[PDB]
A paper describes a structure:
The ovarian tumor ([name]) family of deubiquitinases regulates diverse ubiquitin signals in humans. We have predicted and validated a set of [name] deubiquitinases encoded by several classes of pathogenic bacteria. By determining the ubiquitin‐bound structures of two examples, we demonstrate the novel strategies that have evolved to both thread an [name] fold and recognize a ubiquitin substrate. Our new bacterial [name] DUB structures allowed for the first cross‐kingdom structural analysis, from which we established a framework for identifying evolutionary adaptations in the S1 substrate‐binding site that impart DUB activity.
The wMelOTU structure exhibits a pared‐down canonical [name] domain architecture with a central β‐sheet supported underneath by an α‐helical subdomain, but although additional α‐helical content typically sandwiches the β‐sheet from above, there is very little additional support in the wMelOTU structure (and EV3B). The core of the [name] fold that contains the active site (the central β‐sheet and two most proximal supporting α‐helices) closely resembles other [name] domains such as OTUB1 (1.6 Å RMSD) and vOTU, whereas the surrounding areas of structure are more divergent (Akutsu et al, 2011; Juang et al, 2012). Two regions of structure near the S1 substrate recognition site, encompassing 6 and 7 amino acids, respectively, are missing from the electron density. The structure confirms our prediction and mutagenesis of active site residues. However, the catalytic triad is misaligned as a result of the loop preceding the general base His (the so‐called His‐loop) occupying a descended conformation that would also occlude entry of the Ub C‐terminus into the active site. Thus, while the apo wMelOTU structure validates our prediction of an [name] fold, it raised new questions as to the mechanisms of substrate recognition. Our structure of wMelOTU shows that its sequence topology matches the most typical [name] arrangement seen in OTUB1 and vOTU, and we would predict BurkOTU, RickOTU, and wPipOTU to be similar as well.
Numbering used by the authors: 36 to 96, 104 to 147, 154 to 210
The structure:
């Protein structure tokens, strides 16, 4: 309903990594780039180890150095669920994509890129024909599923969905 009729809600793994798995699936369909959910967590670990800019330390917090070190361990655990505002921003920067989240609350559209998170308004309308936007749906909390495009899915993938 809050998306065009060629899009559908896919399935994500439910071991705590649904954010990473939803991002991975939309990334692969949109750009062809295959990255495992574990590799996406490792990209966030590496971001935190490599002189991260202040937005990141500000978001997750001397005390800063231990907090970053705790993050580098915790982000590799499936128990740590991913957050579009933090891990999504890191992955948008690495993969040169914009992340569109459909949030239920009515449906609100958020767009995240390497510079942070904004509501999709008149100047930042969601573009469902842009191969550099990836799409996920957030039913509540930090629960995510990929929003995929039938036009870009194999017939077998679509039968597995049905």
């Amino acid at each position: 309903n809050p998306y065009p009729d060629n899009f559908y809600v896919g399935q994500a793994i439910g071991n705590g990594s649904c954010f990473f798995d939803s991002f991975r699936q939309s990334l692969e369909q949109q750009t062809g780039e295959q990255v495992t959910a574990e590799k996406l967590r490792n990209d966030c670990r590496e971001f935190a180890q490599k002189n991260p800019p202040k937005w990141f330390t500000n978001a997750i917090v001397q005390h800063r150095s231990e907090t970053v070190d705790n993050y580098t361990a915790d982000i590799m655990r499936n128990s740590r669920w991913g957050d579009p505002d933090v891990e999504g921003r890191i992955l948008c920067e690495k993969y040169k994509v914009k992340l569109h989240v459909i949030e239920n609350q009515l449906s609100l559209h958020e767009l995240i890129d390497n510079s942070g998170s904004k509501s999709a308004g008149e100047y930042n309308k969601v573009d469902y024909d842009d191969s550099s936007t990836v799409h996920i749906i957030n039913k509540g909390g930090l629960h995510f599923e990929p929003l995929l495009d039938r036009n870009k899915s194999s017939a077998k993938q679509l039968q597995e969905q049905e």
